[PDB]
């Protein structure tokens, strides 16, 4: 039984396990509301479930580590999508059009020598 | 990088290493929790009796090749613009140009 997905987002990673169940959801062994408190993180972590309309049928066990709250939510979504793909591997198109299977490669640009930030410069008075 | 500068920093290092332990117990006596005021005073006067140019705080480490007070690196012993010369030739083991 079960299915395993590995999601990754913004220096954060997530291990997700899908089993037969009734949508229990548990992240780091605590409830979804206790983890993502009143924001769109619930929406983003649930998106593939309702798009595939299998929110009620799967029991989910998640362990996430690294990054910030939004990055962790993105990791959960990515892992969930990959595990859902491997479960019933015929709806790759359905997620593909939604852009969930693609892994976002954006990362924090490094600081450069002589500059303040990665791109900001000092003021440049010419006189 | 006068030769006199290097000579007198060498003198300072020799003389600070000369005692190097009397200072230790004298500081221990001064900073001891329960040591009585008289012992505190005797330790203070004895420690102040020592030559002024004998404390580790007066040592300003310089380039061991040129004696440049500035741009010193303690991982190596070299200053700013001898380390680059040594590293370009490949003398320094492990040192390479990096990007990350």
């Amino acid at each position: 039984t079960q299915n395993y997905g590995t999601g990754r987002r913004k220096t954060a990673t997530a291990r997700v396990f899908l089993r037969p169940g009734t949508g229990k959801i548990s992240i780091n062994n605590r409830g979804l509301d206790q983890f993502f408190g009143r924001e769109t993180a619930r929406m983003v972590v649930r998106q593939p479930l309702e798009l595939t309309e299998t929110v009620e049928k799967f029991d989910i066990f998640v362990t996430v580590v690294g990054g910030g709250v939004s990055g962790q939510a993105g990791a959960i979504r990515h892992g969930i999508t990959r595990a859902l793909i491997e479960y019933d591997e015929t709806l790759r198109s359905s997620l593909r059009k939604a852009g969930y299977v693609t892994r976002d490669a954006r990362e924090v640009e490094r600081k450069k020598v002589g500059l303040r930030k990665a791109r900001k410069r000092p003021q440049y008075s010419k006189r | 990088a006068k030769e006199s500068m290097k000579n007198r920093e060498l003198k300072r290092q020799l003389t600070v290493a000369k005692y190097a332990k009397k200072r230790a117990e004298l500081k221990a006596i001064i900073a001891n929790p329960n040591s009585s005021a008289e012992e505190r005073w005797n330790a203070q006067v004895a420690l102040q009796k020592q030559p002024r140019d004998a404390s580790a705080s007066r040592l300003r480490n310089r380039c061991r090749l040129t004696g440049r007070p500035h741009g010193f690196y303690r991982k190596f012993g070299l200053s700013r613009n001898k380390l680059r010369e040594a590293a370009m030739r490949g003398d320094v083991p492990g040192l390479v140009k990096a990007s990350w």
Partner: protein, 152 residues
């Protein structure tokens, strides 16, 4: 740019109204990356809108947006001695962006207690054509139609 290579991004995720336009409005009211604060401000303003009366707050929102997007815009151009100001129709995408920018900027400077109250007042007043934003729109329209000679 010269190369004409810019590609538009797709990040648009209204959480609990499912309305595409409110996400962009919250992006406009956001300052310094604090999505949650702007989120709260907009939702509080919409709660005030829905509790003043019977109107659907979202519907009042797009009614105000329609009643505030300009139709024509004035573009300056120096002709060799004087800078004239031609009129030109506004692209469909630029209308909503201009509308939101004006609405937020004018709600910034009203002077009630909280920013949510300022925004709510602006939506109520501009929903029939009485706000500062609507009269700015009228100023732009008259300025554009007073230069109809060039137009082309």
């Amino acid at each position: 740019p010269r190369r004409r290579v810019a590609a538009k991004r797709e990040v648009l995720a209204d959480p609990k109204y499912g309305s595409q336009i409110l996400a962009k409005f919250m992006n406009h009211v956001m300052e310094s990356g604090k999505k949650a604060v702007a989120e709260r401000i907009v939702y509080g303003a919409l709660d005030k809108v829905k509790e003043r009366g019977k109107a659907d707050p979202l519907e009042t929102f797009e009614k105000a947006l329609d009643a505030i997007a300009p139709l024509v815009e004035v573009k300056s151009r120096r002709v060799g001695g004087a800078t004239y100001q031609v009129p030109v129709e506004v692209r469909p995408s630029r209308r909503n962006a201009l509308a939101m920018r004006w609405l937020v900027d004018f709600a910034r400077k009203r002077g009630e207690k909280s920013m949510a109250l300022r925004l709510a007042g602006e939506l109520l007043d501009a929903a029939e054509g009485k706000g500062a934003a609507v009269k700015k729109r009228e100023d732009v329209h008259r300025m554009a139609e007073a230069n109809k000679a060039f137009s082309h």
